[PDB]
């Protein structure tokens, strides 16, 4: 994966603010080269886990349908990186899994491919692109969680447990929003039926 | 073991030492002042045997090669048989020798890769410092100055820490019945504003190591060979205590 | 300091005795079983006439 | 086995193309237009990096235009080197792993340039594994190996001379 | 600034992840001949957690049609310690572990000539698991590592709901990696759409 | 002074083998049995690290079975490196010098298997750079454009042809 | 830029090198190896200068070797910089340490050049051009440039 200093900061400044302030830690003002401070990089780390781990749990907006991954032309090679959390198929039970480094196809027992195949991925992306409610709701759990691992103080952990409830249900609010999902004439099966 | 000091006599703080190599008879003196400098020049007080204070000549560095070799014979006006030779610059560099198979006598030669005709080092020997912890055990001092330790009771199991001031670079083993565990704390964090490129790695903090064991099987010593100061504090333990095992 | 001999200098067993006398005089005297080498603390051996 | 060299299939309208190596700058990757002839992009011309292991070309660029693959190639640089340590600095992790990471990825390239199955000498001889080299070859210096055109003209040259 | 650099994560970033659930500080080598106490035992944990979670069974680690070929002179099939289970294909599974080869239950028989086919799960690495089963990893070595060294109890609390909340996040991976479908794709219920 | 290959020979029946070279880790070791293919032994099944330096093999593989080299090459990984710098570590020397050797182990690796290559340089021109072409019996047939060393017997042949 | 081949034109004497050094003892060079020339320096190799090079003897081709190469061999085993942990990190020594673990990877690539190719069908082949330097073969197993066949100039000579 990525290290923690590695990406600029732009907006990741607020969220390791209010890590660091889940704690009571002042807040920094540059989350650069002038940080010396320990408690800046260990909310970092745990800001990047959260993201990684809230792209993983499957999103409407990051699941983009229909990629075409392609092979080296010498090789026949498709490549499983890291940044790929999750790596499936359009039809039913999927035949991709991660062989080594690269893409199995474990029903052919064969990585080597010729023309590309399409799958349902889920590209990492900046902790900055995610939408507002998924950064509130990030910074939330990872506030929780350096509290909990550096600090403490129950009732905080109790506030920080409060607070990601409620931003999770507004995370699921914008996700049902975003979609539409209609069950008639949007589902996969019902859809067909209705064209009488 | 190679050594056979003849007399240690001092005057008031000063310990004036003869030392009895199988090659030759040295004397050294040993300088008790709490804060201050052995020699003009030196960085932070550099703990080295045989502390000399040598300005290369010209002649050694040789470009066909980059080395400056010195003659240890001309430094000293003697030759060694054991020891890890350290080498120390006026900033603090550190260029460490080991011994030679067939020991310095055989190769006598400092060889340091660079031009450092006319410039100033301090040789000497490292002096190796061996501390090991008593067990850590449940300690408790009664109404006067008597201390009982608690025999009875679970063999705890633990977990150990350390104190230090203007201290450098210590070891810490921590070895059980069966396996064993090595800790060398080095100098300062990596990206700490302390730990900055061309300044002394020098510090006062506290160093927290695992100590898992049954507390009484588990010895713990600090070694530090090194020429950077070493303080120590205190020290202490966290563990857990139960009340079982009272005879096995 | 200096270098005093070559390991056979003060022989196997001597006794060897501080003299603090004044503090630009301190003088470190080696009693070897056959003679003495009184060696001045900054290793500069004074010849001890017999 | 190669990882610094990768070569796709354009196929038409398909303008984005995955990055797998991991570079150390922008600047040391080499897209090559391979078909006819091979031509080199610029950046923020004919070729943007959308984000970081991805590429986003302006034009589709495809086998009409004679054009039938791209290769995202890495050459990371030797003469620059991205950190330069300083007396004041911080020695913070960046720095040297940067150092190693460059030093590696060089290192890397060029064995993966030299891919190539070939005779690897055995102890300080060229060996070929007992496997001959026939295409044509000439001779015009001393230091030259010999063909056996030469032979043939000795062979006419000791035939017809009596 | 604008380059992708890529740091380990095989036993080393997930050693790391594991010290910090406690205190715990980040090392850096867990390959240095310092013992160091905590990089041996987090990566301990982890590999144990990594190899129960991957015998658990799952759709992925799951390889339906492997066939394992006998040594020809012996006729011996070794029960590597890596095959976590080893059942039949069918209904009934016949192979066991004898000694250290497979032994046929019903045949009473461990001398195979021709070869067997069975649904087998090897062991694989850590960064071969997709990020769901390695944050779950993660979370359960943590947590087990907590409860049985530090004993925090608020962190292993959380960890706990942590170790729930991964489980939920990979059991619903696995329904949709697999799109069973209990009709057409079941095994009984598909024979009976002949209509 | 001392390449990281060391190819050797079968000579019969034969279970204990040397490597010249060191290793940070023995992932880094591969042992390559050549022969009548590119055939290469993995570990825990035909490998058995006695000792430091002491490589033996589970069996002779003598001649008999078409294989007689056996090449002890050392690859390290230029992606999974031993020791990585976080801001919050120690610093221990141990971890610098160890990215150190790793590094000058991949690229003294990638310059041992370059230098023995034939290619063209800047100029155009493609030496040998003095490496005798061993081990290339029969050459010629159908005018393949080299000698194998019986060009002297042939020569002095045609020498008293008269 | 690493590995320069000049011509030893009778007593060129004084060759150049372009690269630039981190020792003197990184600069390896050889006539043609064949009993692997150790060419000490000093004895029969002087640095006249930094970027130049003198050479004790002509060595002209009249020797049996027409070219010297001035390849730069950066050493592995043997380090410039080590590093303990007592000490100061110098910022020169990190600099000189990754600039010499960088030569040798600078040497690969600038070494690394289209390479030879083999042919299933013929065996070996080479597209279609011909070695420019080789080394006279002792052994009667292996191929001959010009340099031991001038017998077929001797029997040139001969018929006519």
Same mark, same amino acid.
């Given at each position: 994966? !990525?290290?923690?200093?590695?990406?600029? *900061?732009?907006?990741? *400044?607020?969220?390791?603010?209010? &890590?660091?302030?889940?704690?009571?830690g002042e807040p920094?003002?540059?989350?650069? *080269?002038?940080?010396?401070?320990? &408690?800046?990089?260990?909310? !970092?780390?745990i800001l990047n886990k959260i993201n990684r781990q809230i792209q993983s749990r499957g999103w409407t907006f990051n699941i983009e349908e229909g990629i075409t991954l392609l092979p080296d032309v010498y090789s026949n090679l498709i490549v499983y990186s890291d940044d790929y959390l999750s790596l499936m198929s359009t039809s039913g039970q999927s035949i991709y899994v991660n062989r080594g480094g690269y893409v199995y196809d474990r029903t052919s027992q064969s990585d080597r491919f010729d023309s590309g195949i399409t799958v349902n991925i889920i590209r990492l992306r900046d902790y900055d692109e995610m939408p507002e409610c998924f950064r509130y709701w990030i910074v939330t759990k990872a506030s929780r969680q350096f509290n909990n691992r550096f600090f403490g103080a129950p009732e905080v952990e109790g506030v920080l447990q409060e607070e990601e409830d409620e931003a999770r249900r507004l995370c699921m609010e914008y996700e049902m929003d975003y979609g539409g999902y209609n069950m008639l004439d949007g589902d996969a099966f019902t859809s067909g039926l209705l064209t009488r | 073991e190679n050594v056979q000091v003849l007399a240690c006599q001092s005057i008031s703080s000063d310990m004036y030492v003869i030392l009895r190599n199988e090659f030759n008879t040295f004397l050294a003196r040993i300088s008790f002042t709490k804060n201050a400098i052995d020699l003009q020049g030196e960085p932070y007080r550099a703990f080295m045997d045989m502390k000399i204070r040598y300005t290369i000549p010209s002649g050694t560095y040789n470009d066909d090669t980059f080395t400056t070799s010195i003659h240890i014979p001309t430094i000293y006006g003697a030759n060694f048989g054991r020891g890890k030779i350290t080498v120390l610059e006026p900033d603090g560099k550190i260029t460490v020798f080991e011994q030679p198979t067939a020991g310095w006598n055989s190769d006598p030669w400092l060889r340091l890769s660079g031009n450092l005709e006319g410039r100033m080092v301090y040789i000497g020997f490292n002096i190796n410092f061996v501390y090991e912890f008593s067990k850590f055990l449940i300690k408790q001092t009664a109404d006067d100055g008597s201390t009982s330790t608690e025999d009875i009771g679970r063999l705890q199991l633990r977990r150990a820490w350390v104190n230090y001031e203007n201290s450098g670079t210590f070891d810490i083993y921590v070895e059980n019945q069966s396996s064993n565990w090595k800790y060398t704390m080095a100098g300062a964090r990596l990206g700490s504003n302390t730990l900055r490129a061309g300044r002394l790695n020098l510090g006062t903090g506290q160093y927290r190591f695992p100590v898992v064991g049954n507390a009484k099987f588990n010895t713990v010593y600090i070694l530090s060979d090194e020429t950077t100061p070493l303080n120590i504090i205190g020290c202490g333990w966290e563990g857990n205590y139960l009340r079982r095992s009272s005879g096995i | 300091l200096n270098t005093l001999g070559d390991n056979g200098a003060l022989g196997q067993a001597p006794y060897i005795h501080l003299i603090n006398r004044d503090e630009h005089e301190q003088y470190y005297a080696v009693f070897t079983g056959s003679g003495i080498r009184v060696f001045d603390l900054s290793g500069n051996e004074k010849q001890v006439r017999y | 086995v190669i990882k610094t060299v990768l070569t796709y299939q354009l196929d038409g309208s398909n303008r984005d193309f995955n990055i797998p190596f991991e570079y150390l700058a922008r600047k040391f990757v080499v897209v090559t237009l391979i078909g006819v002839d091979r031509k080199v992009l610029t950046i923020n011309t004919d070729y943007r990096f959308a984000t970081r292991t991805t590429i986003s070309l302006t034009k589709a660029w495809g086998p009409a235009d004679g054009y039938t693959t791209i290769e995202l190639r890495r050459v990371?640089?030797?003469? +620059?080197?991205?950190? +330069?340590?300083? +007396?004041?600095?911080?020695?913070?992790a960046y720095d040297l792993n940067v150092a190693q990471i460059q030093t590696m990825h060089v290192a890397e390239e060029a064995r993966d340039l030299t891919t190539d199955t070939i005779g690897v000498n055995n102890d300080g001889h060229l060996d070929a594994r007992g496997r001959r080299i026939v295409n044509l070859a000439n001779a015009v210096d001393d230091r030259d190996a010999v063909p056996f055109g030469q032979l043939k003209t000795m062979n006419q040259n000791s035939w017809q001379a009596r």
């Open positions: 994966m !990525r290290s923690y200093d590695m990406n600029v *900061e732009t907006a990741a *400044e607020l969220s390791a603010v209010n &890590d660091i302030l889940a704690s009571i920094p003002v540059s989350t650069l *080269e002038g940080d010396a401070n320990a &408690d800046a990089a260990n909310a !970092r780390r | - | - | 990371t640089s030797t003469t +620059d080197r991205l950190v +330069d340590f300083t +007396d004041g600095s911080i020695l913070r």
